[PDB]
Every structure is written in structure tokens, then in C-alpha cells.
Amino acid sequence: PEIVDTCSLASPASVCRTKHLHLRCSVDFTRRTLTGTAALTVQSQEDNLRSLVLDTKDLTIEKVVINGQEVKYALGERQSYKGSPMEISLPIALSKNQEIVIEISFETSPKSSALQWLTPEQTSGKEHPYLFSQCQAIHCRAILPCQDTPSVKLTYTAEVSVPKELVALMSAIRDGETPDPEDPSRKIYKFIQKVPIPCYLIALVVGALESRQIGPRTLVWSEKEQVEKSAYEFSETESMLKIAEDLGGPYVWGQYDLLVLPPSFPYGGMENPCLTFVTPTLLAGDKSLSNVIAHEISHSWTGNLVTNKTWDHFWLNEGHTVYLERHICGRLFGEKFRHFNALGGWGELQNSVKTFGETHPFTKLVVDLTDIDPNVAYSSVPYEKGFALLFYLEQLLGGPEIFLGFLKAYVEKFSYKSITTDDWKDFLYSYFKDKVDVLNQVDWNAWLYSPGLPPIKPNYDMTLTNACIALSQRWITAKEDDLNSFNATDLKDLSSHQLNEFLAQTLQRAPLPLGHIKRMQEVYNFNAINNSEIRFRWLRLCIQSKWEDAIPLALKMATEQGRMKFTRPLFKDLAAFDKSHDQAVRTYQEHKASMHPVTAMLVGKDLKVD
Numbered sequence: 001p002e003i004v005d006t007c008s009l010a011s012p013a014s015v016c017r018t019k020h021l022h023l024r025c026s027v028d029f030t031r032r033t034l035t036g037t038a039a040l041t042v043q044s045q046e047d048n049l050r051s052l053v054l055d056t057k058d059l060t061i062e063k064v065v066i067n068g069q070e071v072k073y074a075l076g077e078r079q080s081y082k083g084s085p086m087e088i089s090l091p092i093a094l095s096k097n098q099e100i101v102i103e104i105s106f107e108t109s110p111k112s113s114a115l116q117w118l119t120p121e122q123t124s125g126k127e128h129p130y131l132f133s134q135c136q137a138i139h140c141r142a143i144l145p146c147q148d149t150p151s152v153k154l155t156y157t158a159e160v161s162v163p164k165e166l167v168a169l170m171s172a173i174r175d176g177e178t179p180d181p182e183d184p185s186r187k188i189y190k191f192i193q194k195v196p197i198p199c200y201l202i203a204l205v206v207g208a209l210e211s212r213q214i215g216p217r218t219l220v221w222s223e224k225e226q227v228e229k230s231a232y233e234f235s236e237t238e239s240m241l242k243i244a245e246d247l248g249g250p251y252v253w254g255q256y257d258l259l260v261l262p263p264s265f266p267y268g269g270m271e272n273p274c275l276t277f278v279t280p281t282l283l284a285g286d287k288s289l290s291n292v293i294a295h296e297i298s299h300s301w302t303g304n305l306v307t308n309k310t311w312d313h314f315w316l317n318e319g320h321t322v323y324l325e326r327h328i329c330g331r332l333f334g335e336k337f338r339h340f341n342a343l344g345g346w347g348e349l350q351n352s353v354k355t356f357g358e359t360h361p362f363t364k365l366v367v368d369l370t371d372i373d374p375n376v377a378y379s380s381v382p383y384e385k386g387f388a389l390l391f392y393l394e395q396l397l398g399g400p401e402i403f404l405g406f407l408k409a410y411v412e413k414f415s416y417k418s419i420t421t422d423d424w425k426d427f428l429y430s431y432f433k434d435k436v437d438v439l440n441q442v443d444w445n446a447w448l449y450s451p452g453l454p455p456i457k458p459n460y461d462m463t464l465t466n467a468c469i470a471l472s473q474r475w476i477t478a479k480e481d482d483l484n485s486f487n488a489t490d491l492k493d494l495s496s497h498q499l500n501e502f503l504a505q506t507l508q509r510a511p512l513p514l515g516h517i518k519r520m521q522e523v524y525n526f527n528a529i530n531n532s533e534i535r536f537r538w539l540r541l542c543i544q545s546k547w548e549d550a551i552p553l554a555l556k557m558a559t560e561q562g563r564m565k566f567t568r569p570l571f572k573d574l575a576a577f578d579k580s581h582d583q584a585v586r587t588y589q590e591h592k593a594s595m596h597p598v599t600a601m602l603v604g605k606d607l608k609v610d
């Protein structure tokens, strides 16, 4: 079983493995460059190893030092989104298992796809700049030379010099701070990550950060203006951690902190070890969007302990995590809620499959990313089709109690390892040996390798979903003279979640007549709702139903925050509506330079500009 990572240009794990990274760098806001040395302790896996290749992307290399002497290295031609391979000539051939340290002096480009540099005006405080990284999937190579593949796991230590007024934090345990001996206007923050991790989990943030403790092993960090709101919004964090520990085994990372980033953070959450990054769009005021914390917490087992070997097997990370996530919510709020969320996930899968096309390669559970930018293939498929498969197996094999026994042994079995779908499947068969008959009823080829919706849809309790569907159907089948019958009391017994699902169901049948949409605003006043998931769906419904009043509202939401999940579909809907098309494009052209590099690239592609 020889498997290569087609998204990486580095020497594979079968040739050599990075065991540790000692990073020493300075964050230069005036130049928007990170400069320093990356000392990689590498272990040869081959006899007579004389060179090796690392991934790099828009990096400027000053020199490479081994045994205190500069050595030869060469940068190959850039290969689009993969960057440029860096081949290093070892000064002395290595035997199998020999380890050496390679010190690389480098500097990042202001354009690094792993970073977003924000001016003071783009922050809450308005006085200090801010920097944040986002390495998943393959952007770590845009910060430092490395074997940018999740098939290799390393520990790391780091020293980061930053303006003394600011604070640095990383996906690691804080290991002290001191004034920078080479520059008194700076402070050096130190970090240590003793647990081997794939490099996509390396993370850094530098800004005017403050903290507040919200649990025995949790601090929430953000700019001062957001601290109080965040402490409240995420107060269930420790109870979610305890439940996750009960599902996957002991939490091995020490601390579990949360960092609430500026509005341009591209995801709802990112499971960086010891410090989960989250979007400020989660600050609904009622803790209603907390499934995102449950999800990132779950990656502490599925994703960070047991890791997908290559991005072709991404579903292993997300599928199991969404499955654990819904179990935490099920324990906190009831089995019927778990089913409600499961069913909602299926609807999101329908949307993705419909958007790409039912035969499209990106709708396969296991995808082949050779020549495909992972940012482009990213969708809800690995999450929901992966979740649907596990939920299907759960029902097939005897229920949640039994399948949760499998998930815990799976984590235990593959801790600190990087695996493929076959490893997963092999273990599933081993664990459920007394039920191979049942496992053999599964159409494996269709589930794992065929595009479109899964061959089978799991059974779902519909208790909580029914009222959402009923109301959605009343609006869709209503004619003009039925509009008067709608009234605020329709929403009387719906939770924010059900309100959201009601909108999701209606959005699947959009457009609705303009008159229906105006009436909906008249009786439900959806424009007043600040919950970002609800606002997102409501505005999409308004724009697709061609209500010009919603144009400025949609443009505003699309630009004041940058969570891709919201910004991309909003710009896309605005561009597809002829009345807002020109302004959408113009708005994008205008904000482009100040957006997240990756998000700007994807929106540009979606709008067919550039």
C-alpha cells in the first residue's frame, strides 16, 4: 500500500520525515512579511539519502544551513496553487533513520495565501494592526518551507518577535514572553507543541488581544470590544469538552482556548490545537450557533489525533467530526434535536449535489485532488455525505451506543497516525467482524466513489422538522388571497433553529413571488434578525426572489464579514440578479485588495472577473 500526496511537491514520508520544527521569526507589519529561520529536524527513511524536497509558496529563501555551513538548494518552476518545490543538497549522505537539522532562512511574501494582514482600520480597536494565519489545507507552505502534507506529523517550538504592544498566540502551549534583545520596541513570545501534528495545524495570530477565562482549561481571546460577548456566547465550552472526552477518550492537548477573530476570518471554525479559531459571526447573543464549537472540539480526536493521510480522504476528518458533533448536541439537547440536525445536513447535501451537478467529481466522498486546488473542491459533500454514511452504518449496525463504541476504538487505534479510507474500512470490518454480513449489504463503491446523492438515505425522526416543512409548504402553495392569513404567531413555537430550517426549505424552492417575500417581511420582520445563519438565508431568499430593497442589505453582509459560507453565495446571488449585477462586481473590485487572499480568489472566480 504505497500512497502519495498529489497536493504536495515535497519528498514523501517514505523518503524522509520531519520530526520537529523550531521556528524563530519576527512579524514585520510595515513590510507585511514574516521573516526568520525554520529549523527542521529531519529523519531519513532511506539509505544513502543525498537530497530532499520541500514545499514552498511565494517564499524568499536567503540560505540553507546544515552543520553550520551553507549548502546548495534549488527552487523549481512554480506549479500553480502548489507553489514551488525546493530541493536541498545534503552535505553528507544519510543512512536510514539518521536525523539531521536543516536551518532555513526565509521571508514570506505580503501576498502569502496563508495570511491576512489587517490595518488598524480593519480591527475593532482601530489603533493596532492584526495578523492571522489559516494553513488548512495546503497553505503552510506559504508561511515556511516544509513537507506540506498531513501524512507527516511533527512537534514544534517557536519564538515570535512582535511589536511590544501586541500579543502573539499559536496552536501550542504558551511558554513565556520577554523583551526582544535585538529590538526593545518588541516582545518575544514562545510556544511549544509536544503533540505530533500535521503542519496544516500550525497557526499564528498577532494583535491587540485580551483574554477571559470561561472554564477550568479554557480562555477566550479577542480584541477588548468582543471579550464579554464571547465569554457568554461560548460558556457551554467546558461541558461540551467533557462530553467529547466521554465519546473519544481523554483530551490530550492540555488547554482548549478559543480565539474570536476579525470578521474576515474565512471559516466558522478551525480546530488549531490548543487554540480553536472562530468567526465573530457566531456571536448571536443566545448561544444558538454553538454546534460550531462542538464540532471544532471533536476534531481534537478525529482530525488532530487521527488525521487524513492526504486531502483525497478529507471526509475522514470532517465526516467523523460532524458525527461526533451531532452526538454532543444530542446529549445536550436530546436525540430528536440530533435527528433534526442530521436531517438538516441531508438538505445541505442536496444543495451541494444540485450546485455541482449530480455526476460531478466533487460530489464523490473520496475525491482525486491531483491538479485540483483543494479550496476549489471544498464543499459540504465530505461533511454530509460522510456524515450520512456513518449515520447509515449506525442504524445498520445496532444504534448509537454500539457505533460510538466503534468510534472510540477507532480513535484509540489510530491516534497520532495519518490514515486512508482503506485503513478506516479495514478497521470497521475488523471491529464489526461478527457483522460482516451486514457490512456487506453496503454498496461501498457507490458510497465512497460514485458522485451524486448516496444510494440510501438514513431514517430520520422528523418531530422537530415537521412544523418547519408545514410552514414552508403554506408559503410556497399560497396564492395572493392567502397572504393575509399569515401572521407573527406562525413563528410562536419555533426555535431559532426551526426558523433557520423553515428558511432553508423555502430557499430550496426559490424564487417565491415578490409579493410573498414582502409579506413575509411585513409579518415576520426577518430584517430585524441578527443571527447570521438566518440573515444569510433570508437575504438569499430575498435576492433570488428579486426584491431590490434587499440589495444593499445583501451587499452589506457580503462585505462586512468574510466567512466564505456567506460571502460567496451572497456575491453569487447578487451577480445573478440583473438589478444588482453591476454593483456586485464593482463592490468586489473595490474590496478585493482588503479581503482574505483565498476568499478574494474564490469570489473572483465565482463572479468570472479578473
Ligand SMILES: CC(C)C[C@H](NC(=O)[C@@H](O)[C@H](N)Cc1ccccc1)C(=O)O
Binding pocket: 136, 137, 266, 267, 268, 269, 270, 271, 291, 292, 295, 296, 299, 318, 378, 383, 565
Ligand atoms: C461546524 C463546522 C461544519 C464548521 C466549519 N468548520 C470546519 O469544518 C473546520 O473544522 C474545518 N477545519 C475548516 C476548514 C476546512 C478545510 C480547509 C480550511 C478550513 C465551517 O463552516 O467553518
Ligand SMILES: [Yb+3]
Binding pocket: 479, 481, 482
Ligand atoms: Yb384562493
Ligand SMILES: [Zn+2]
Binding pocket: 295, 296, 299, 317, 318, 321
Ligand atoms: Zn471540521
